[PDB]
Amino acid sequence: TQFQKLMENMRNDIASHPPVEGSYAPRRGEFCIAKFVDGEWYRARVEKVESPAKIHVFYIDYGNREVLPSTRLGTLSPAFSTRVLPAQAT
Amino acid sequence: TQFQKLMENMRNDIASHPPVEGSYAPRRGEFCIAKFVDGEWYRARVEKVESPAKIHVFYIDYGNREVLPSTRLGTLSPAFSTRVLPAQAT
Numbered sequence: 001t002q003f004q005k006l007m008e009n010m011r012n013d014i015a016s017h018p019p020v021e022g023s024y025a026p027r028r029g030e031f032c033i034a035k036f037v038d039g040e041w042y043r044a045r046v047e048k049v050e051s052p053a054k055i056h057v058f059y060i061d062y063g064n065r066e067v068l069p070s071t072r073l074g075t076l077s078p079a080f081s082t083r084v085l086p087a088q089a090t
Numbered sequence: 091t092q093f094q095k096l097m098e099n100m101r102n103d104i105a106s107h108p109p110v111e112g113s114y115a116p117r118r119g120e121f122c123i124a125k126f127v128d129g130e131w132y133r134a135r136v137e138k139v140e141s142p143a144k145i146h147v148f149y150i151d152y153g154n155r156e157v158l159p160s161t162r163l164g165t166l167s168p169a170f171s172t173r174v175l176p177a178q179a180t
Contacts, residue, residue, distance in 0.1 A: 057112075062142035063159065066115055066142070067115075
């Protein structure tokens with residue numbers, strides 16, 4: 001699937017240009033990458049900023065949510081944006 | 091039955107404080123509540139995290155497994171934990 005292909009490409013790119021701590025600042029409505037409980041990165045969207053340790057995100061390709069620290073968020077590179085592949089949730 | 095009484099009390103409590111999307115994050119070996127195909131909540135344990143939409147759980151009072159999204163999982167309140175009544179799988 002296009003989703004599986006984007007995830008392979010994105011995760012290879014992230015492993016090659018690992019997010020730098022503090023570089024990405026979450027803002028409501030922005031797309032980003034989020035590191036899920038499995039240790040893997042996923043495309044996400046920031047929904048609410050409660051605290052630096054508590055950012056509410058939506059995993060745009062999988063349809064679920066998580067509250068996680070800023071440290072587990074990074075910049076979504078334009079190569080893997082929703083301009084390239086729309087959100088795949090459902 | 092002890093099981094019947096705990097389920098009633100647990101479900102009444104869940105209804106008073108429904109799980110909030112994103113609040114509970116699944117991790118292997120943790121207990122949680124899981125919403126089965128009958129629309130009812132059951133005690134469960136996380137066995138494997140495949141993706142945000144695919145969490146492998148074991149229904150600890152019934153002995154079956156299901157793969158379900160994070161949205162259908164919630165925190166198991168201490169009042170209904172295995173410290174209160176052990177896993178009842180037959």
